[PDB]
């Protein structure tokens, strides 16, 4: 209804649009330049690039675990790589759209925050805050139980065992050998602290966007 409201929605839609554009660039295993984004995604909002690209970069990092890192400063060329140097992204078999690295990092970070292991109850507690629920197929992440107890176990990122001496049965999660080799408790906890402490980028109003121009 309002002009400033339709402008914020236009910028918010570009973040969505640029985020999916960068995701397509990652799956295609290609580089991306600033000029490519200015021409193919935000042609009519070029001077808002820092805000749009910043919001889209952070969303790829938090949701899918992809880093958008500048390769060459003078060329404004960026590469798309998994966070924390993990060699897994879940783009395999029939899952060829959405990387699962982001959720794995959130699970790995939940376990490291708890110490040597996290029980099943508090893994489901943490996931429930993101709308992820046992036995329910999330639109992006998929079904989590299979991800936790089959995929990531067989990939050796996680261990899923019963608590020693339980009555009745009780399960917990641990870092598998691959997680310990590719990253560490310290690097993952630091990543969580950096993500959570990043100052949010504000959408510029029409007036502030006019000062940019």
């Amino acid at each position: 209804a309002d002009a400033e409201s339709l402008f914020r929605e236009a910028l918010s839609n570009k973040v969505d649009e640029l985020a999916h554009f960068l995701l397509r660039k990652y799956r295609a295993k290609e580089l991306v330049t600033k000029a490519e984004m200015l021409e193919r995604v935000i042609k009519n909002y070029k001077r808002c690039f820092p805000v749009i690209f910043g919001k889209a970069s952070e969303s790829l990092k938090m949701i899918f675990g992809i880093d958008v890192k500048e390769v060459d400063p003078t060329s404004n060329t960026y590469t798309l790589v998994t966070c924390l140097g993990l060699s897994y992204d879940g783009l395999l078999g029939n899952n060829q759209i959405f990387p699962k690295t982001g959720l794995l990092i959130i699970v790995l970070g939940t376990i490291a925050m708890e110490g040597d292991s996290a029980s099943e109850e508090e893994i489901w507690e943490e996931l429930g805050v993101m709308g992820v629920y046992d036995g329910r197929e999330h639109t992006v992440y998929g079904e989590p139980r299979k991800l936790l107890t089959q995929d990531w176990v067989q990939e050796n990122y996680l261990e899923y065992r019963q608590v020693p001496g339980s009555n009745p049965a009780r399960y917990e999660f641990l870092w598998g050998p691959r997680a310990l080799a590719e990253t560490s408790y310290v690097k993952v906890l630091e990543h969580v602290v950096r993500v959570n402490a990043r100052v949010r980028i504000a959408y510029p109003s029409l007036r502030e966007a006019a000062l940019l121009e």
Binding site: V15, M62, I63, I106, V140
Partner: peptide, 20 residues
């Protein structure tokens, strides 16, 4: 509001719970 916006806000909440 948007489906993508909610996905960002929910991931944000996941990182806040771990950090706490």
């Amino acid at each position: 509001k948007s489906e993508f916006q909610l996905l960002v806000d929910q991931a944000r909440k996941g990182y806040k719970k771990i950090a706490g």
